[PDB]
């Protein structure tokens, strides 16, 4: 789906830093894609948002399983919104996890 929003991370390199971000990414956080690169997709977190999420999404990245979960994020600007955030793992030819791809599948509302 290359008009979403979405990252790819890569789990290989330390912290998951963001190797890939979308144009509609791009739009939908007011960052530049040189402010994103090599980042933890966190940085999009802020005071309002959930830590109880938070927890979720750690919990699915150590258990490698797709999930979806609503969470407020910010703007470059500070603008909150919810994000309904979707995370898929992605395996190599031998099933070892390669990639994680983040979908913001819907940025509020
Ligand atoms: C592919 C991918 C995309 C992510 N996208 C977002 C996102 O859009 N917004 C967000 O708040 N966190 C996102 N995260 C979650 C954070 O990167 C991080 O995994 C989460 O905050 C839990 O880890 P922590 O407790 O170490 O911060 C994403 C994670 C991955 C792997």
Redesign the pocket.
């Given at each position: 789906f290359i008009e979403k929003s979405f990252?790819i991370?890569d789990p290989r390199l330390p912290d998951?830093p963001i190797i890939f971000a979308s144009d509609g990414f791009l739009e939908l956080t007011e960052y530049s894609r040189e402010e994103i690169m090599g980042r933890?997709?966190?940085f999009?977190?802020g005071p309002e948002?959930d830590q109880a999420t938070?927890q979720k999404?750690?919990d699915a990245?150590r258990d490698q399983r797709e999930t979806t979960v609503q969470?407020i994020?910010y703007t470059k600007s500070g603008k909150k919104f919810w994000?309904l955030?979707h995370?898929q793992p992605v395996r190599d030819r031998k099933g070892g996890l390669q990639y994680?791809?983040?979908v913001?599948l819907v940025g509020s509302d």
């Open positions: 990252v991370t998951y933890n997709a966190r999009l977190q948002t938070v999404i750690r990245i969470l994020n994000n955030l995370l994680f791809i983040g913001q």
